Every structure is written in C-alpha cells, then in structure tokens.
C-alpha cells in the first residue's frame, strides 16, 4: 500500500525513475530534475509514468486524488500551498484520461496539469528545494542529502572510532549486538529491505549492476532462498546471507558505491560522476573512514 512520503523517499524514487529512463542523455536528465516535462522529448512519456506510480499518484486505471490529498495533508505546514490549491490539483489530476494506462496517456494529462500549476507539484511532493530543506532541518530523523545512509545510521548506534564501528567500516560486518539495529537501518535505507520487511531482490541486483558486475544474479537469489532468518534479526541475517554468497570483496565493492551515491541520489545522473571508477573509489572510502574516525 501507499502512504505519504517524506522528502528523502520522494528523492529516492525520483532518482530511480530517472536512472531507469534517461538513457545516458544528461541534458534530458537535467530537464527532469528541473521538472521541465515536455511531450516532445522522446523518453519523457514513460518517465512520467514511472514517477506518478512511484509517488502514489497513479494506481488502477486513473490517478488517485485521495493519495495526492493525503500527501498534501501530511506536510501542509511546510509545503507552502494553500488548502484551496491543494484540494484543487488533487481533483484536477483525478479528472485525467488514463483509462488504458499507456505512457503517452498518463504523461499527457500530467504535463497538462503541471504546466497549469507550475511548481506546485514539486512543493506537495517535497522536491522543491526550500520545502525539502526546511523539513530536513525540522526532522533530524530523516536522512538529509550530504550524508551517506551508512553514516546516518552509524551515528545512531556507534560512537565514532569505537572498535566495533571500525570493523563495520573495514569488513562490512560485525558480530557485536549493535549491528542488528545498524544493518536493519542500512538494509532498509538501501531499499534492499522494503517497508513491509521483505527483501527486494531487484534492489540488490541494482547495486551489482552499478559496479558493472553481471554474472551474479542467480547467486543472490540462492543466498536469499536458503537464508535462515529470524524476525528479531531479519535484515542482519539476510545481509549476512548476501555477504557470504557474494564474498567480502564483491559485497564491499557494491556497498561502497551504494554509500557514495547515497549522499546525493542524483549522483549517476550528472555526467562527470556517471561512470563507476574503481580508482576514484579508494580515496572516497578513505574519506568515509576518516569521517567515522576509523
Ligand atoms: N535525502 C537525500 N538523500 C540523498 N539525496 C538527496 C536527498 N534529498 C535530495 N537528494 C538529491 O538532491 C539533489 C539536489 O542536489 P543539488 O542539486 O546540489 O541541490 P538543489 O536542489 O539545491 O539543487 C536532488 O536531485 C536529489 O536527488
Ligand atoms: Zn575484511
Ligand atoms: Zn540463468
């Protein structure tokens, strides 16, 4: 089921749709980040479809006005949109064609509504820079941009420089009791574990393909299938199952790149940081060790 999303959740989902559809056209990716959605750019049609489904705007045959209303209500004290305009676009979007559910059908009505209320959707869905940043400042429990998911989780459970923490940095795993909470936080933050507590196999494979690995899909599937996990330590156990299946070297190569990208989800969509560079990763991992005082 869908529920209101915080600015980190929307930014995560937006970046995932952009990566899946931009097709190495960075100028088109730049337009999407600015929400310059124009039917006339080839790939934009199916990108909008990805975006509205991921944001809970589109479900069955047409849009869901009560989802958009729920998203507006969840952050009305911060989105800067009047109650009149809020309920307006919810109903205004829920009067769309849709019906069949094609890319060009949903994108046409979305681009049409977006241009009639420019900037309002970015505010309601917490992608507007001022709305996003104010929410982050008032909600320290949400991971903001500029800090990695592992560092954000690590600061909750470990003292900087403590031995168990530096083992996590060095080997990606720890036997100490705090690692159950930490790996639950990071596996969920990486979306390897979904909100409902179940593993997302495709999300793990995204991390492998990001570092240009290709033959290990059926290896990950077996690790998950044969894993004996108890609900008290569910994420930790699946995390260790993936660790053992891939081995430390490959597992950490995947995790290090996930960590670097988690500071700003648009990382791979800028051209200079669009390609995995194993040589550049060494100094990035070193800087993250230093940040943790390890
Ligand atoms: N919590 C977050 N964690 C990681 N990346 C985030 C988060 N929130 C937003 N982002 C990313 O931040 C990017 C914006 O970075 P930057 O362009 O320098 O900031 P701004 O919006 O001010 O331009 C967005 O495209 C989004 O992907
Ligand atoms: Zn090691
Ligand atoms: Zn096969």
Ranges of beta strands (E only) in 70-195 are: none
> Does 174 belong to an annotated binding site?
no
User: In terms of residues, how long is the chain?
Assistant: 294
CB 47 within 8 A of CB 18: yes
Is there a binding annotation on residue 265?
yes
209 CB-near residues (< 8 Å, 6+ apart): none
Which has the closest alpha carbon to 33: 57, 52, 14? Answer: 14
What three-state secondary structure class fits 50? helix
* Tokens 């979306």 found at: 191
Instruction: Check: CB of residue 96 under 8 Å from CB of residue 106.
Output: yes
Contact 242, 220 (CB under 8 A): yes
CA quadruple 8, 14, 20, 21: dihedral, nearest 10: -160
- Give the separation between CA 170 and CA 174, rounded to whole angstroms: 10
Helix (H/G/I), strand (E/B), else coil: 199 = strand
| Listed resolution, Å | 2.0
Does the beta carbon of 33 sit less than 6 angstroms from any atom of ligand 1? Answer: yes
Q: What is the 3-state secondary structure (H, E, C) of the chain?
A: CCCCCCHHHHHHHHHHHHHHHCCCCHHHHHHHHCCCCCECECCHHHHHHHHHHHCCCECCCCECHHHHHHHHHHCHHHHCCCHHHHHHHHHHHCCCCCCCCCHHHHHHHHHHHHHHCCCHHHHHCCCCHHHHHHHHHHCCCCCCCCCCHHHHHHHHHCCCCCHHHHHHHHHCCCCCCCHHHHHHHHHHHCCCECCCCCECHHHHHHHHHHCCCCCCHHHHHHHHHCCCCCHHHHHHHHHHHHHHHHCHHHHHHHHHHHHHHHCCCCHHHCCCCCCCCHHHHHHHHHHHHHHCCC
Q: Is 143 in the pocket of ligand 1 (CB under 6 A)?
A: yes
What's the angle, vertex CA 60, arms to CA 119 and CA 108, rounded to 5?
Answer: 40
Are the C-beta atoms of 227 and 193 separated by less than 8 Å? no
CA 171 to ligand 1 center in whole angstroms: 29
| Region for 81 from its dihedrals, namely left if φ exceeds 0, alpha if ψ lies in -120 to 50, beta otherwise | beta
* H helix or E strand, kind and range, residue 191: none
**Best of 34, 145, 147, 148 for a ligand 1 pocket test (most atoms within 8 Å of beta carbon):** 145
- Is the four-CA dihedral 34, 102, 124, 145 of positive or negative sign? negative
Determine the Cα–Cα distance for residues 284 and 294; give it in Å rounded to an integer: 14
Which tokens sit at 145?
Answer: 């941009």
Q: Is the CB of 136 under 6 A from ligand 1?
A: no
Distance CA 122, CA 101 (A): 23
Distance of CA 242 to the CA centre of its chain: 20
| Residue 137, token pair as written in the block | 């400042």
Q: Which bound ligand lies closest to the C-alpha atom of 131?
A: 1
Q: Rounded to an integer, what distance in angstroms lies between the CA atom of residue 217 and that of residue 28?
A: 30
**Is 58 strand, coil or helix?**
strand
Which position has the token pair 């004290």? 77
Q: Does the annotation flag 130 for ligand binding?
A: no
**Closest ligand 1 atom to the C-alpha of 144?**
1
CA separation for the pair 240, 183 (Å, rounded): 9
What is the Å distance from ligand 1's center to 268 Cα? 12
Question: What are the sequence ranges of the domains in the chain?
Answer: 1-143, 144-294
Query: What distance in angstroms lies between residue 260's CA and the mean position of ligand 2's atoms?
Result: 19
State residue 259 phi and psi, 5-degree precision: -60, -50
11 ligand 1 Cβ < 6 A:
yes
List the one residue out of 196, 197, 191 whose CA is nearest residue 149: 191
Q: Is the CB of 69 under 6 A from ligand 1?
A: no
Q: How far apart are CA 101 and CA 1, in angstroms?
A: 19
For the chain, give the residues followed by a break (C–N over 2.5 Å): none
Cα 88 from Cα 85, distance rounded (Å): 5
Let me know: does 183 contact 235? Beta carbons within 8 Å.
Answer: yes
Q: Indicate which ligand has the atom closest to the C-alpha of 127.
A: 1
Alpha carbons 99 and 154: distance in angstroms, whole number: 46
Say which DSSP state 232 is in. Answer: G
CA 208 to centroid of ligand 2, rounded, Å? 19
Query: Phi and psi for 253 in degrees, rounded to 5?
Result: -60, -40
Rounded distance from Cα 33 to ligand 1 centre (Å): 9
8 lines ligand 1 (CB under 6 A): yes
Q: In sequence order, what are the beta bridge partners of 199?
A: 193
Which SS3 state, helix, strand or coil, does residue 16 take? helix
- Phi and psi, residue 199, nearest 5°: -70, 145
> Which residue has a Cα nearest atom 19 of ligand 1?
129
265 Cβ closer than 6 Å to some ligand 1 atom = yes
């Amino acid at each position: 089921e869908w529920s209101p999303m915080d600015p980190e959740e929307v930014a995560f989902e937006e970046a995932k749709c952009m990566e899946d559809h931009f097709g190495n056209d960075f100028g088109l990716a730049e337009k999407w980040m600015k929400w310059s959605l124009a039917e006339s750019d080839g790939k934009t049609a199916c990108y909008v479809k990805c975006l509205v489904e991921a944001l809970g705007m589109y479900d069955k045959q047409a849009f869901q006005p009560n989802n958009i209303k729920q998203q507006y209500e969840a952050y009305k004290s911060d989105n800067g949109v009047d109650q009149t305009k809020g309920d307006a676009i919810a109903n205004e979007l829920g009067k769309i064609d849709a019906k069949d559910g094609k890319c060009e059908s949903i994108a046409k009505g979305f681009i049409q509504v977006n241009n009639a209320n420019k900037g309002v959707l970015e505010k309601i869905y917490l992608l507007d820079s001022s709305v996003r940043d104010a929410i982050y400042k008032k909600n320290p429990q949400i991971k903001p941009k500029g800090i990695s998911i592992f560092r954000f989780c690590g600061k909750q459970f470990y003292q900087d420089g403590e031995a168990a923490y530096c083992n996590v940095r060095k080997h990606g795993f720890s036997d100490d009791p705090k690692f159950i909470k930490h790996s639950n936080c990071t596996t969920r933050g990486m979306r390897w574990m979904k909100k409902n507590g179940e593993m997302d196999e495709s999300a793990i494979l995204r991390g492998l393909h990001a570092v240009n690995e290709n033959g290990k899909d059926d290896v990950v599937k077996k690790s998950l299938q044969n894993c004996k996990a108890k609900d008290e330590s569910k994420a930790r156990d699946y995390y260790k199952c993936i660790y053992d299946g891939l081995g430390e070297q490959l597992f950490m190569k995947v995790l290090d790149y996930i960590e670097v990208r988690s500071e700003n989800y648009s990382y791979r969509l800028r051209e200079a940081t669009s390609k995995y560079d194993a040589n550049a990763m060494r100094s990035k991992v070193k800087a993250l060790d230093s940040e943790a005082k390890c």
